[PDB]
Amino acid sequence: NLEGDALHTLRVTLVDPNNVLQSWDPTLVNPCTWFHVTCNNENSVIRVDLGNAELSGHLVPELGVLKNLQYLELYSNNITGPIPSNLGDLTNLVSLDLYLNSFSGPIPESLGKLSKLRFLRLNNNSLTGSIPMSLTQITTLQVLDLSNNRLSGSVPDNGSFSLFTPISFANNLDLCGPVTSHPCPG
Ligand SMILES: *[C@@H]1O[C@H](CO[C@@H]2O[C@@H](C)[C@@H](O)[C@@H](O)[C@@H]2O)[C@@H](O[C@@H]2O[C@H](CO)[C@@H](O[C@@H]3O[C@H](CO)[C@@H](O)[C@H](O)[C@@H]3O)[C@H](O)[C@H]2NC(C)=O)[C@H](O)[C@H]1NC(C)=O
Numbered sequence: 001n002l003e004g005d006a007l008h009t010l011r012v013t014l015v016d017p018n019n020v021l022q023s024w025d026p027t028l029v030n031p032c033t034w035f036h037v038t039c040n041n042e043n044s045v046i047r048v049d050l051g052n053a054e055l056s057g058h059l060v061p062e063l064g065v066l067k068n069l070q071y072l073e074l075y076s077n078n079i080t081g082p083i084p085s086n087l088g089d090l091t092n093l094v095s096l097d098l099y100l101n102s103f104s105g106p107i108p109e110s111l112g113k114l115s116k117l118r119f120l121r122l123n124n125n126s127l128t129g130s131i132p133m134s135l136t137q138i139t140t141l142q143v144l145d146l147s148n149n150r151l152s153g154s155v156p157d158n159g160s161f162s163l164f165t166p167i168s169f170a171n172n173l174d175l176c177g178p179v180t181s182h183p184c185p186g
Pocket residue numbers: 051052053054055076077078102
């Protein structure tokens with residue numbers, strides 16, 4: 001059970017004072033009966049729903065083996081560290097909700113590979129660096145929130161970013177461009 005091993009590895013590295021993940025018993029045939037985990041009819045994980053679960057610690061790159069994952073709902077916790085650089089491995093993701101956490105480092109360029117993504121909500125973290133241009137390749141994007149981070153540099157208004165307005169980018173370190181409220185000096 002590769003998927004269960006990956007999720008158990010996540011449990012080890014997350015900090016879970018309330019033992020929300022107590023049921024995450026890797027001796028089971030699969031993780032489909034675990035609390036907060038949902039599988040499809042083929043017993044493959046499609047949702048991890050851990051919003052507002054009083055978790056901290058960091059994520060793990062083993063998340064990338066959850067090939068059928070559609071929802072990664074980890075918002076409103078105190079998770080730290082970087083967004084794993086390989087989250088773009090999760091090509092069936094339709095929602096990536098990491099908002100209201102303590103993530104730092106850059107937005108991974110690999111997120112541009114998430115060609116089915118509808119929700120990308122990373123607001124209210126401590127993310128730094130520039131927004132990857134690869135994100136404009138995500139033609140399905142409908143809800144984007146990168147506000148309240150420490151992002152800097154130019155933001156394009158092309159591809160799917162043409163859909164969004166300054167509220168999606170507000171209160172960063174030094175963003176500029178047509179979709180933001182400040183033109184780029186160059
Ligand atoms: C860690 O995350 C919490 C919020 O997350 C919530 O509480 C955790 C303990 C876990 O149970 C999470 O699962 C849960 O979603 C942050 O605490 C919150 O801090 C904010 C301030 O940044 C407080 O918000 C408000 O402040 C404004 C005034 O500016 C008003 O709207 C409100 O009156 C409120 O005070 C909020 O109260 C507070 N929440 C709790 C439960 O303490 C915490 O700061 C964060 N850690 C870090 C380092 O960011």
